[model samples]
Each structure stands twice: as C-alpha cells, then as structure tokens.
Target: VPAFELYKAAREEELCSYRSLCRVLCMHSGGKLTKQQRRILEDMREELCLPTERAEAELAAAREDVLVTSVAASGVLKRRQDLE
Candidate 1:
C-alpha cells in the first residue's frame, strides 16, 4: 500500500477495540517501508526545527536505520539516540 494509505491505516488501526495490525512494523523492518513512507519521513525530517550542525547525510542514514520494526518483534528504535 502507499505510505499515505498505510499511514491512514496505521492511524485507524491504533488499538482500543480493534484487532492489531503490523503494517508499520512491516514497514520498519530492514528499511522495507513503502517508498511513500520513506518519503514522508524524509519530509518530516525537513519540517523539523533542527540545528545547522545536524549533518543531513548522517541524519538521513540514521533515520533510515532507526525505525521500529514492531513492538511484537521487539524491534529496536534508534530514533531517540539520533535526536540526542
């Protein structure tokens, strides 16, 4: 699915009474996100108010590496450290 659609699905799928879904996890794993998701995240990074010292290439590389595959899979989230 397209990332916007996937994102929409992700938003709707947030569990309260609904059964679980792992699209985001599937997206997160091994950098396998739908191209749109990667692009969206790249856009999100640009939208951030960050310092000039933040190296764009490293930032790009790090963001690519930091996504959480799944809480179910005990996937690692490196986003926190990247921001720090």
Candidate 2:
C-alpha cells in the first residue's frame, strides 16, 4: 500500500502526530526524496519532536511503499501495452 493508505490506517488508530507528519511527507515525496526534500523533512521532524530513529524507520517504510507502487504502476502499463 502507499504511504497515504498507511497514514489513513494510522489515523483510524489515532497515531502519533510525528508519525502522521512523516507519512504525509513521504506521500508527497513519491519515490525518492531530493536533498531539499530531505532538509524539509528534517525541519519538520525537529518541529514535531519525532525521534530520529522512529522517523527514519517510518521514512524507510514509506520509501519502499512508493517504490512498490511505482513498480506496480509500471506493470499495469506494460500489461496494457501488451494487450494493444
């Protein structure tokens, strides 16, 4: 599932604010985050008082989700092309 989906699930369980922020940031980042984007995440992390360990874990999961989603999308496109 995508980071947004995870965020929604977490929201249902009333997740921590910092975790929610990380998910949102990851969702906006798509696949890979640029240096500027990483800086932004760091800024938000400090503001939200999220521990570096926890934040890194969440971001890592989110990045994997993004990659999975992108790969799935590419597979779908390939299938459509095959059918054409």
Candidate 3:
C-alpha cells in the first residue's frame, strides 16, 4: 500500500496549500471576497481536486480568522485614538 500512502500524503499537501491560499486571500480581501475572487477560488478548488463542501469550509474558517483579527485591530486603534 505504499502507492496508496503516497497518494494520501500528496492529497494532504494539496489541501494544506489550498488552505494557506484561502487564508491569504481572505486576509487581503478583508474577509469579504468579491464575485471575481470567489470565481477564482472556485477555479482553484477544482484544479486542486478539492470538493465544494471542503473548499467552502476552509473559506469560512479563513474568513472567520480574518474577521476576528480585523475587529481586534480596529478596537486597538479606537482605544489609541481615545487615549490620544
């Protein structure tokens, strides 16, 4: 089952790469992907052999992370403004 093991490893690597890309895209777009960006992501998902459900899940998780970071950063900025 060496071949099967190799396949599994390759698939895992692909998934990791996809997830990283999604996270970067989410951060760059401020968690709200435009239609064009969504289309691009859909194409990438197909190219990466990821299922729709899995891709959606990853996007959701990445968006959540970005949103949380943005909110925290904004809060910090507001606090600084108040102090100033």
Candidate 4:
C-alpha cells in the first residue's frame, strides 16, 4: 500500500524535474539526499542568493559523479567543463 501511496502522490502532485523526483526518492529511499549532495546544492543557492532559477540551475548542474568547476577563471580553457 505504501508503494501505491507513493505512486498516487506522484500523479496528484507536480513533478517538474529530477529535483522534484527527490521528494518521492525520500519516501522510498530513506528520506535524505547524500551529504555531498546536500552540501553542493546548499552552497550553490547561497552563492547565488537563493534565486529559484539558480537553485534549479544548481540541481541541473549536479547531475553527475564529479563536479569539477571554476568560479571565474576568465577563459574557456580554464573552466572545468560539463560532463559529457
């Protein structure tokens, strides 16, 4: 019944992206993202002053195993690059 409960919740609620997918992930997968995941997301939003778009962007930006980055390197070659 709990599985059904989660499935039903999905239909009634808005699931706009993978981050939204996180709500259900909590229900079935133990209700917490990893510490590293939490840290990165929190740090990103803080850095950007909590803009929803930027928080959303941070989630998208965190879609991989590694998150190599450069804050302001001033050159394309200096940037860490996105996962391909």
Candidate 5:
C-alpha cells in the first residue's frame, strides 16, 4: 500500500497540469488548439498545478465558473463555472 501510494502520488504529478494531455490533442492534428480550446487549456493549467488541499480546493473553486459552463461540465471533473 505504501508503494501504491508512492506510485499514485508520482502519477498524480503528471495530471498536476494536464494540459499535456490536451497538448497531445493539439499535436494529434499537427497544429495548434482553438481559442475556446485554449481557454479550456488554460483552465486545465490552473486546475492541474494545485499543490495542496487548500490550493486544489481554491483552484477548483476559482475555475468552477470557467469549467462548469464550458466543455467541462461532466466526466472526471468536479467543477462548476457558475461557482467560478
């Protein structure tokens, strides 16, 4: 379990600013992302870089507005742009 926690913690850093995921999306087509997509990308940047419980909670709260109302309303996210 300790090894699992360490592994998960290391893996969590990759998701820490998951624009890298979105960047893969951009690179998939061999070009740049769209403006709206970029906005969401920026939001992704904010969401992933959260370092602590407080930071994560605060970032989630801050971007809730930008996230919930946009293309991030569902799926693996816990945010609401209305709250942002």
Candidate 6:
C-alpha cells in the first residue's frame, strides 16, 4: 500500500493517533525508515498537533445522502454490492 493508504487504514480502521501513525510508519516496511521518511512522519506529527493523540480534522455539516467517507479499501465511497 502507498503511504496514504496505510495512513487511512491506521486512522480509520485501527483508530491510531498521529504519534502512533508516525510510529506505525516507522515500524512498517521492516521497521526501518530513511531520513526522508522519518522527516515525513515528523511533519505528520506536527500537523496533528499532539505528541500522543489521534488526528482529527474538524468537519461540521448537515447532510443525509451526499457524503465524503468510505468504509472499505476502495477509493469511491460506495456499497460493495454496487461496485461489484
């Protein structure tokens, strides 16, 4: 999986925090991280605004049908049956 895919899984599925995401990314790929990768993780840490907490971007809106989230690995947020 690409970085963002892993990131999405870590965040939505595993309920991982930002710091944990950094750690996860570091621990991933045989627990070895290059300088640039580590830097990227560090940047994510800063963006989340916590040393050890979940990354949550505030999104406030009221809608019923239209949405912007998914519950699977697929890109489009649609029912598996529909996709199939």
lDDT of each: 0.42, 0.63, 0.78, 0.44, 0.49, 0.42
Top-scoring candidate (lDDT): 3
The predicted structure with the larger TM-score, 5 or 6, is 5
What's the residue-level lDDT of 48 in candidate 3?
A: 89
- Candidate 2 backbone collisions, by pair: none
Worst 10 residues of 5 by lDDT: 23-32
Candidate 6 per-residue C-alpha lDDT over 1-84 given as tens digits, one digit per residue, 9 for 90 to 100:
899998777655433444344433433322345687667655765665443333322111111112222221233333457777
lDDT of 3 by residue, 4-77 (tens): 99999989998998888777676666677789888888888888899889988988888788564585346554
Task: Name the candidate, 3 or 4, with the larger TM-score value.
Answer: 3
39 Cα displacement, candidate 4 (Å): 2.1
Residue pairs with backbone overlap in model 1? none
Q: How close is candidate 2 to the true structure, as a TM-score?
A: 0.47
Better of 2 and 6 by lDDT: 2
lDDT for each residue of candidate 1 in 1-84, tens digit (9 for 90 to 100): 898999667654432111111234243444455677556545544554333244244334433443433432453443657555
TM-score against truth, every candidate:
0.28, 0.47, 0.70, 0.26, 0.35, 0.32
Worst 10 residues of 3 by lDDT: 71-80
In candidate 2, what are the lDDT values of residues 1-84, reduced to their tens digit?
999999778654432655555555555555466788788778867776667887788777666675545654455444666768
For candidate 4, what is the TM-score? Answer: 0.26
Ranking by lDDT: 3, 2, 5, 4, 6, 1
Better of 1 and 3 by lDDT: 3
**Scored by Cα lDDT, where does model 6 land?**
0.42
Top TM-score prediction, candidate number: 3
Candidate 2: stretches off by over 4 Å = 1-30, 66-68, 71-84
